[PDB]
Symmetry: D2
Subunit: 125 residues, 4 copies
């Protein structure tokens, strides 16, 4: 029922070699797992998010976002990343994102709590 | 079972007058609703996210994040915001966040797709 | 000749206790020194930037930005911060900024090169 | 005298087709002009910034930043962009940046004042 429900659902890979496995629900839900190739992380972590299930039809992307808290049964990096971006469908489908990675800190160190970057996900490689 | 499960769960308000209603699950889940005082928005929107259910005990905050896609039964702003931040417990509990608001755009306009800002949530006002 | 040349020029302090000393030139230039209360820093560092010397008159802020590279005669933190924001004049003048702090890294660590945050500068305290 | 003074100085192009013309001073200064291929802009605008004139030698990049206020003799977009990033030398030299573009706004619209994105500059194309 979601316009890009089928186009978003599946396995995605970014430029770092991370793997994003997502299911897009008819209603706007995103659920899945994330495995980072880098950082204080091992194996899969739960993700959840949301996407625009009725996007504009005018060649525009589909807005979406999701979160990973970096705790699983193997490790806890006391941090969470949120990706915010858009899905662009077609032969070379992509999800283009910017992210914010916040660590738990003391109040004295909160100024240095948050990393920012950008990931591009593709269906191959 | 989550360390700040009780401290996070409930109603939060930010500096804009927005209202965040969240339940924190024992496992790391965040679910709830968001109502923005500003922007292309009306009434409540679904949110989901994650938090560190076993944070450091050393005076450090609790990392968390969540997403809203700005589609509900009233409006669709073809956009999604992700907040990334930390919960700081105590008499004056706060959630301190930075956010990324991505709009669906054409590829030609993707350079101007994403707003960034910061919200502080409190339990009063 | 700059509309807020007089309002911007002078000494500013942020919420961390840092001190920003700036001169605004008629043409749009910003020059001065920055002293951070936090981080890998001591004493003053050179800053340069730019501001909108002919802003809108409609109650709107004045856009501006500036950079500090964190090298001086005392220390080198192999990093640079840029603040991007707006000057809001009046009894309680403020400069409201967001910043990006990039460290030199290897290519393998570039994903974790860049911190993001927000500073508010006032003329007192 | 700056380690990458020679490597930074010159003409750079980003993925949008914008042109960055910079001189790096021995002392850490960056001066030049920027011409954007997109947005509310025409022709060249003054830029100034700073870079780490004595970077780490260990395969690490060179931290730098610069600002453009989007006022010149042709147009005034009441905004400023700051790029924060690192120069990576070698056969395929690059400057990898993240940026913050703040517009002057009323206080009521300040939540939507600031765009964020990422530009990669190369010496060709």
């Amino acid at each position: 029922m979601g316009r890009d429900e089928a186009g978003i659902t599946g396995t995605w890979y970014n430029q770092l070699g991370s793997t994003f496995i997502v299911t897009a629900g008819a209603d706007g839900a995103l659920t899945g797992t994330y495995e980072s190739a880098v950082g204080n992380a091992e194996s899969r972590y739960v993700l959840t998010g949301r996407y625009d299930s009725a996007p504009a039809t005018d060649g525009s992307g589909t807005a979406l976002g999701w979160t990973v808290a970096w705790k699983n049964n193997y490790r806890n990096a006391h941090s969470a990343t949120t990706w915010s971006g858009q899905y662009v469908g077609g032969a070379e489908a992509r999800i283009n994102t910017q992210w914010l990675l916040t660590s738990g800190t003391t109040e004295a160190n909160a100024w240095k709590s948050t990393l920012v970057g950008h990931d591009t996900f593709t269906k191959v490689k």
